[PDB]
Amino acid sequence: EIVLTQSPGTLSLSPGERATLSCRASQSVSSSYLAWYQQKPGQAPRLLIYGASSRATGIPDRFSGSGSGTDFTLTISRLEPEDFAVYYCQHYGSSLWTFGQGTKLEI
């Protein structure tokens, strides 16, 4: 299978700062099937980025991203307190799904 690994596993950042979260695939993947999600405890995962780009409807627009092959990144242009969250990348291979690593962001 194709395993996604994100980094850093945990991180402490201040509001007002730029932040990035990486997602590396063990095998190359189509950018068109990659997505990023945000999660708060007790909530269903929220989609932010799909197709390794393409900001999701209703998104804050502070989020953007890009990538290809085995290397993808989620960028937050400025962190707001509401952006401190668990974030993960997933691959929707449609016959295979890959999940794991929440790069947990705290103040």
């Binding site: 068109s32 269903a44 989609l47 799909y50 197709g51 993960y88 929707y92 449609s94 799904w97 999940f99």
Partner: protein, 116 residues
């Protein structure tokens, strides 16, 4: 347009099965695919398996190969997942998610907590 509607929370005894119901609102039950994802407390998400209601095809995660049966009711636009031989290890929130062909978005239900 697309809305996923799930059944409520349940409490089980060891050895029993849980059948989670997911209704596809907005249409396109057919010509789309439905998957089930589990989240044990304190954990991230994991894939359990899924079905393509139109092609009558099921597919399972190796971790969940066996125990769980996934079906789909075309007439009521409803997908089901029944996980047998439950243990306290299976306490989790069970989520329904789907994608239409022609689209890129993955639509999600609410997640239902099942304890054992």
């Amino acid at each position: 347009q697309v809305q996923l509607v799930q059944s409520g929370a349940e409490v089980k005894k060891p050895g029993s099965s849980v059948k989670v119901s997911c209704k596809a609102s907005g249409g396109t039950f057919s010509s789309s695919a439905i998957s089930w994802v589990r989240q044990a407390p304190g954990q991230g998400l994991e894939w359990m398996g899924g079905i393509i209601p139109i092609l009558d095809i099921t597919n399972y995660a190796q971790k969940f190969q066996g125990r769980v049966t996934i079906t789909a009711d075309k007439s009521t636009s409803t997908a089901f997942m029944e996980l047998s031989s439950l243990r306290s290890e299976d306490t989790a929130v069970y989520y329904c998610a789907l994608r239409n062909q022609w689209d890129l978005l993955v639509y999600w239900g609410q997640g239902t907590l099942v304890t054992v």
